[PDB]
Structure formats: structure tokens, C-alpha cells
């Protein structure tokens, strides 16, 4: 099973063999197996529960509570929240303050997971608990009647499976204490129930197709077909079945749709990105219609969903950093951004060549030119850096600070260091091809193709941009030198291919002097 974990680290057949042999070994030996499971699958609350059910089998009551402090906030799985309430029911049950502690536990669950469709028994177990709380007198009995009524009125708005049975128990509780006033209290909240009962039947359709139990796997057939059922479930809740203007009721239901999807497909950057962009959209939408204190509440929540991506599941995934970097520039917290960028740079095995481009693209844009060159100073001193930041930096100086010499000195700084990369040189070839001096661009061409800093075998596209340049300017005497010289430098692989090589002296963008059927047999290729 460990050999299958070497090729595929997420081989669910190989992980299940570790689960099959987990109950055939004691709690001291199986613990090393489950901690390799739940740290590798942090979102799979089914896989959290099996080790919680293992630790509750060995009666390690202190260790089960530390598991609840580790994964309950990050995993909104319904069987996990059932196991959390089953633990406090058993363990805390003999305490004298159990009636305070257990009643806190149900209300803490219904705020976060009570919206889920199978959460009906979570409602009922707190209904019977409040009836189980002993109250003597008349005021304490009316304290019981008030407490049971409040969970009734809240639960009969929430779409779920057995909403027809909660209202049936609601009718018998109102008639159970006073038949006369039951005819009004049932009638006063009946119309909002009929909206709640209707949308609950609408909520069955998109939820019966989903899995809600798969481990979080990055994309590698069925997996992309599952994503479509998640994007349907996201955009259907964006379609607002409960038709209302209150964006706070709109967003938090879509946020509940986001949190359920991040359990199943948390290694997908789009589900993280479409999460907080909806919060950035809901930030400026609540900023218009008066609700100002809640505009920043979703705005810091937008940074929070981005924070959970880079901290929990996707640490080496660059895309959610830059979405979290450019979100904080849009909130104008520029000092926070440098902590975000340098957090990514501390990670060992990435390619900082892209990051130094974007971390230069922040400093010029928000803090000025001199702040940009301090970043480009840090880009030169990093070993892991490749040639692309030398291309960007000279273009950041030329296009923005309007200077040609600094754009020239940065490019010449890279050409001394990275003159054996053909993708670098072509990015400096077409820069000098567009500055309108035939003396500038031709001098560079003979530098690259003679000094031997670039290997000649990888310089085919260098020579291909040469004849693109000597055909716009220069004379025919200059071209016929080169196509004798370029053919001399590439003698091995161009013998027999001369006439197909001639087309690149005469071609424009899509204009070829022959048909596509004729160039197929001449040996023509398109770079």
C-alpha cells in the first residue's frame, strides 16, 4: 500500500488499505496511520470522524477534545457536528452545569451547520433537551415555554428534509399548552413557513446529485463532471431562490454553499477564487446601500477565505496569493501586501521568477519607481530566479518611467548573466526591433550570434527574427549574405529544405506565396 502511495500520494485505494488495517491494530499504533491521513486530508470530515471514533473507543477523552479544537471550525461536515454533540452528551453528562454546557453546544452548531439539509435531528435533540431541563414554579415553566418556542420559530424558516414534521410538532406544542391561542400563533408565522417549505423542495434537486463525502483531490472524466454540479449549486444559490434584496441573507447562503464545496474540492483554486470575489462583489454592493459596518465585515472575510487557501490546503499554489495580494491593494492596505508576497518567497521550492514580476508590478504601481527597483534588487539576489524578471523590469522602466537608458542597462545586465537562454534574448530582440534604429537592432543581432554566449543549436528563432528585420530595412545585398551565412550555421538540418526556408524571406503574417497543400511537401514549418 505504501508503494502505491509513492506514485499517487492521494491513491484512495492505497489510503483505504491503511484504513482497513487501522482497526486491526491498537490505538497507539493506529494513531500514526490516522495522523498521516487527517493531516493529508484536512477537509474530509468522514476521515476526521473515524479517528475521533477510534479515540472514543480507547476512552481517551482528553485527546478527543483536542481533535474538536483542531478540525471542527475548518470542517463543516454534518456527521462531524453530530459526533461533536454525541461527545458532550456522553462525557459532560454527569456535570452539575451540564444543562448550561449542553444547551450552549446545540446553539453553537445550529448557527454554523443548522442550515444543512440533514440537520433536522440537530434541531429535535435540543427541543427534547429543553423539555428535559427541570423547571419548578410558573415563571421557570414560562422560561421553558419561551426557550422551546424560539427554536421552533427559527427552525421553521430553514430549508431541510423533515420541515413538514417540525411544523407538525409545532402545531401540537401550541395546542399542547393552550388550544385557544394556538389558532393565532400557528397562523401568524404560517405564510413564511410556506415559503420555507417550498424552497426546501427546491433545495432537494441540486443536493441529491452531489456526493458531499469525497476527499479533496487536485484535478488530474468524473472529477470535472463533479465540478459542474458544484458550479450549478453555486450559481443557483446566486440566482437567489429566496428572492430578497437583503445582500447579507443572500451572501451568507452563498458562503454556506462555498464552505460545503471547499470540503470536497478544496485543492481547486477557482472555488477559492470565486468565493472571495463574491465577497469583494458583496463588499461594494453593501457599501452602496447604507450597511457600512457590514461592508468591512465581508471585506475582511474576503481576506479570510483567501487566507484559508494559502495556509491550510494550497500553500505552493501561486494564484491564490496574487488574488490575495491584489485584493489588499484594492483595500489600500499596502503594508500588509509586502507580508503576503514575502510569505510566498519564504517557501522553498517555488519559482519566484513569476512572483518577483508581480511583486515588482505592485511596487511601481502603488509606491513609485524607486520602490520598484528595491524589489528588483531583491530579485537579483535570489538564486531561484530565472530570466523573466529581467525582461519585465526593463519594460517597467520604459513603459512607465519613460526612460530608454535604464531600460537598456537592465537588459544589458541580464544579457551578461543570462545570455544562453533563447527565450530571454527574443524578448530583448523584439524590444530593440521596435525602438526605430536599424543601427541599434542589427548590432545586437551580431552580438548574440557571434560571441558564443548563446548556443548556436538553440538559436533558430534568433535567426528567424533576423530576416524579419532585414526584410523591412536594409538592402537585398544584406539579405543574401545572411541566408548564405544562416544556412552555413545550420548546414546539418537545412539541406533539402532551402525553398521551404525561402518562404520566411517572403511571408507576411498569414500571406504565403504558395498554397498550404504545396508547403506541406516542401518541408515548411511555422515557428
Amino acid at each position: 500500500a505504501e508503494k502505491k502511495l509513492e506514485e499517487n500520494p492521494y491513491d484512495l485505494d492505497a489510503w483505504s488499505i491503511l484504513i482497513r488495517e487501522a482497526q486491526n491494530q491498537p490505538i497507539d499504533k493506529a494513531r500514526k496511520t490516522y495522523e498521516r491521513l487527517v493531516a493529508q486530508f484536512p477537509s474530509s470530515g468522514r476521515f476526521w470522524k473515524l479517528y475521533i471514533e477510534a479515540e472514543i473507543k480507547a476512552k481517551n477523552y482528553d485527546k478527543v477534545e483536542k481533535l474538536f479544537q483542531r478540525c471542527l471550525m475548518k470542517v463543516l461536515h454534518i456527521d462531524l457536528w453530530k459526533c461533536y454533540l454525541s461527545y458532550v452528551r456522553e462525557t459532560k453528562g454527569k456535570l452539575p452545569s451540564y444543562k448550561e454546557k449542553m444547551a450552549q453546544a446545540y446553539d453553537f452548531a445550529l448557527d454554523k451547520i443548522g442550515m444543512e439539509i440533514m440537520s433536522y435531528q440537530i434541531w429535535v435533540d435540543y427541543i427534547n433537551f429543553l423539555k428535559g431541563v427541570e423547571a419548578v414554579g410558573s415563571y421557570a415553566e414560562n422560561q421553558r415555554i419561551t426557550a422551546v418556542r424560539r427554536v421552533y420559530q427559527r427552525g421553521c424558516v430553514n430549508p431541510m428534509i423533515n420541515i413538514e414534521q417540525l411544523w407538525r410538532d409545532y402545531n401540537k406544542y401550541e395546542e399542547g399548552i393552550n388550544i385557544h391561542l394556538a389558532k393565532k400563533m400557528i397562523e401568524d408565522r404560517s405564510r413564511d413557513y410556506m415559503n420555507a417549505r417550498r424552497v426546501a423542495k427546491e433545495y432537494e434537486t441540486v443536493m441529491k446529485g452531489l456526493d458531499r463525502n469525497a476527499p479533496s483531490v487536485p484535478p488530474q472524466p468524473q472529477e470535472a463532471q463533479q465540478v459542474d454540479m458544484w458550479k450549478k449549486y453555486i450559481q443557483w444559490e446566486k440566482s437567489n431562490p429566496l428572492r430578497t434584496e437583503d445582500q447579507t441573507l443572500i451572501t451568507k447562503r452563498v458562503m454556506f454553499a462555498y464552505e460545503q464545496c471547499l470540503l470536497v474540492l478544496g485543492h481547486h483554486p477557482d472555488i477559492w477564487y470565486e468565493a472571495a470575489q463574491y465577497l469583494e462583489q458583496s463588499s461594494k454592493l453593501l457599501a452602496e446601500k447604507g450597511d457600512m459596518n457590514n461592508a468591512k465585515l465581508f471585506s475582511d472575510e474576503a481576506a479570510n477565505i483567501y487566507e484559508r487557501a494559502i495556509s491550510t490546503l494550497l500553500k505552493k499554489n501561486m494564484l491564490l496569493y496574487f488574488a490575495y495580494a491584489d485584493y489588499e491593494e484594492s483595500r489600500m492596505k499596502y503594508e500588509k501586501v509586502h507580508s503576503i508576497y514575502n510569505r510566498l518567497l519564504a517557501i522553498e521550492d517555488i519559482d519566484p521568477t513569476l512572483v518577483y514580476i508581480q511583486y515588482m508590478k505592485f511596487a511601481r504601481r502603488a509606491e513609485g519607481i524607486k520602490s520598484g527597483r528595491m524589489i528588483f534588487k531583491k530579485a537579483r539576489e535570489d538564486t531561484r530566479t530565472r530570466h523573466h524578471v529581467y525582461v519585465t523590469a526593463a519594460l517597467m522602466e520604459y513603459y512607465c518611467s519613460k526612460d530608454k537608458s535604464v531600460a537598456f542597462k537592465i537588459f544589458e545586465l541580464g544579457l551578461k548573466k543570462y545570455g544562453d537562454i533563447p527565450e530571454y534574448v527574443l524578448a530583448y530582440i523584439d524590444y530593440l526591433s521596435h525602438l526605430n534604429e536599424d543601427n541599434n537592432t542589427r548590432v545586437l543581432f551580431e552580438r548574440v550570434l557571434t560571441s558564443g554566449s548563446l548556443p548556436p543549436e538553440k538559436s533558430g528563432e534568433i535567426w528567424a527574427r533576423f530576416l524579419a528585420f532585414e526584410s523591412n530595412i536594409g538592402d537585398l545585398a544584406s539579405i543574401l549574405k545572411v541566408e548564405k551565412r544562416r544556412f552555413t550555421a545550420f548546414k546539418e538540418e537545412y539541406e533539402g529544405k532551402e525553398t521551404a526556408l525561402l518562404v520566411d524571406r517572403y511571408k507576411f503574417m498569414d500571406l504565403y506565396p504558395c498554397s498550404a497543400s504545396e508547403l506541406k511537401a516542401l518541408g515548411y514549418k511555422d515557428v
Partner: protein, 302 residues
Amino acid sequence: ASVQLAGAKRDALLLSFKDAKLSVVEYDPGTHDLKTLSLHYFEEPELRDGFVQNVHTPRVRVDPDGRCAAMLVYGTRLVVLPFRSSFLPSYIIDVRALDEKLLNIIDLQFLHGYYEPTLLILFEPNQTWPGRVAVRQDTCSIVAISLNITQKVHPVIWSLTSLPFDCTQALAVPKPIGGVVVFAVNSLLYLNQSVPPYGVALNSLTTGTTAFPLRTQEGVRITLDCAQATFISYDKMVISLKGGEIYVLTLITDGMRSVRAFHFDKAAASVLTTSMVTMEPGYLFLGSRLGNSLLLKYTEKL
């Protein structure tokens, strides 16, 4: 406003009269009177969008190169007069049908530099009142619309969107530095397309009223709400405040022609103005309704 047209021997005057009448006039020799060149009546009831009570005055600005001139009819209708007869037929850009939903214009200026008549337009798309800044912190904005005259389009190049809530008049800074200074009541900004925003605060009433990044101007505690200003050739602006106090703002410039810091000096006090003019270099005029509007003379100190 005034503009020397194509091949003209004099400078025409773009007057603007109430309910959106433009009138380009000229002095004539021969008869010592005026001479109307063009009459533009814009008092059409579909140009109001129903707003009977005209509150905004029609404001005439000219492009400093003399390419076109723009009147803001009724607050919501940029009427553009193209230039080269010495004229071209006008047209009415709708303001509210642009990007960014401008909708409450404060000032508009023709900016310097450029290849096309770029017109900066301060506005307030979600309007607030000084007196209500705990739910609406800072809502002033800028669009530098770039007028294509021939093709009759207008790209909304360059927008900033969280300027302080109480910005009074905008002012085009001339060619060798470029950009704009935007007088706010309690601050003073210098904005440009390729440069980050730099603006300082002029009292501690910018504390709970502004989220824009404001430094602290040392040795200055004043306000700029009704403050007329003009520019010395480059990097010196004569602000006459309310209270008639003349300050000569110095924009301290780096070697790359970017504004680093500001520099005030409390110069002399004078008339409670309503306008300001640089005449012959070393003379200023302070046009004022309430007070003898007088001619000044500044010199260099040793």
C-alpha cells in the same frame, strides 16, 4: 474663456450665459464694438433630464493647445466645440452615460501635455455632506476623459476613486510637471497618471474624515474651501484663501519631474477674492465682488 483660433489676428472670447448659452465674440477694428462669431443655444428641455431648477452653472474651459473647448451644460452634458469658417459643429456628450457614472460634477479642467484634449472631471458618484462622515467616509473621484474630436468617441483613461469627500475645485498643473492639484477643504492632493497619489493634510480635521493616505504638512494649519489659484510658470502656485490670505505653494520636484513634497509660505494678505489672474510676469490680479479688486506685484526676496 479665450482661445486664439486658426489664423485669427485676435483672441475670441467664449462667454457663457444663463441656461446654457455660449457666445463666441471678438473685438472688431473699424467699428470699435464687439462682433459675435457664433451663437449656441442649449436650452432644450431634453437636455435637462427633467430637472427644471437649474442649479449648476454652465462652465467654459478651453484646451490650452486650442484644439477644442468644452461647456458643462446643466452639470450632466459636456458640450464640446471642436475648432479648426474657423469652427466645426458641436456635439453633446452625455455625462451620465459614460463609464463610472459621474453624476455629481464638482470641477472640470483641460489637462496639459497629451496629444488629445484630455479633460479631468472631479465628481461624487455617491454624494455625501460634511456633517455626515461616519457612514460615507470619502467619495470624490476623478475621470480624465480623452476627447477624440474627429471620431467623436471618448476613452475614460485614468480614474481614482477614494479621494476625500470634500474636494473643492480642481486645477490643471502646467506642462513641465503635468498632472493636477485638487483642492480639498482640509487637504491638498497632487495626482498624475503614472505617479502614485501624494497629498498632505492641512489640519487635524482629516483624522476621522479621510481614509486617503495623507501626510502632515509641517508648520501649516489652514483650510482650502473657497480658494482661488493660478500658476507661476512652473512649480509655484498662488493660493489666495478665504480670508484673503495669499499662500504661494511650492511643489517640490525630483529629478524625474515628479512631485516629492509641498512647501508653503505665508505671503501677504489681500482682498477677499473671487478670481485670480497672472498678468505680465510679476503682476497678479485679484478679481473680487466684495472688495476693491486690485492689481498686485510680487518680487523675489534676497
